[PDB]
Amino acid sequence: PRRRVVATREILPDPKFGSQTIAKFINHVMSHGKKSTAERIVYGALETVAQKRNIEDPVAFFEDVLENVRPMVEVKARRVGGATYQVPMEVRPSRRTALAMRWLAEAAAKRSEKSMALRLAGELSDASEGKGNAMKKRDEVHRMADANKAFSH
């Protein structure tokens, strides 16, 4: 807003892992307020990748892929006397997680697998090694930040 910084809402964890990170990703996958549909999409993706990779605890795998997708430097528009400068700045960690989750969902939304859960699992697997449209978007953002790398205002 314009005056204060709101106290953030509490997010209850996912029922089947007890992790607020997976709960927040379920929210990012959600549409029209359908928690059950979003939860089954995300859980199908997670069980698919877990059964394919033979990993007992996939929350750590999700943390790994999330930190791999997270950018560190984002380009912000600044105004100095009528000049629009694309100054690269750091990303605060909350925005880091939000951007990573949004990029993962929007990249998984455009793939070619049959089910959305299969699409999301394939995208998680791909970003685990370092490929996929989430990785391309992160690389694009880093590319623009380094392309400027000349305004430290």
């Binding site: 000049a83 400027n148 790398k149 000349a150 305004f151 430290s152």
Partner: protein, 115 residues
């Protein structure tokens, strides 16, 4: 070949040129902000001067210069960044001098811009 050198930091409002010569005045290497990929507004920044000084120093370091004294001239922004670049590139600075041409009320300046 030469161990003592002079780094001239000619810095204008538009561009900054970093030349490195011997004590006598014969140029060994040079770099410019406009010759390092930056053009227009980016070219007249301290960062472009930093990379120009880095390139010029790394090109002239093969000659054998380790001792160098800098000669800053002009009002541009990269006049301070180029010296830090040279210092961090491993050059042993001898002295920092600011030899900029200052007329004693000589030739008439160009007219004031009406912008």
């Amino acid at each position: 070949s030469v161990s003592e050198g002079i780094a001239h930091i000619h810095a204008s409002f538009n561009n900054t040129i970093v030349t490195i010569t011997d004590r006598q005045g014969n140029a060994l290497a040079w770099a410019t902000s406009g010759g390092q990929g930056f053009r227009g507004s980016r070219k007249s920044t301290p960062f472009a001067a930093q990379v120009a000084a880095e390139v010029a120093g790394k090109a002239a370091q093969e000659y054998g210069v380790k001792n160098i004294d800098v000669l800053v001239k002009g009002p541009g922004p990269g006049r301070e960044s180029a010296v830090r670049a040279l210092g961090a590139l491993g050059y042993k600075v001898n002295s920092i001098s600011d030899v900029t041409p200052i007329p004693h009320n000589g030739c008439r300046a160009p007219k004031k811009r009406r912008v």
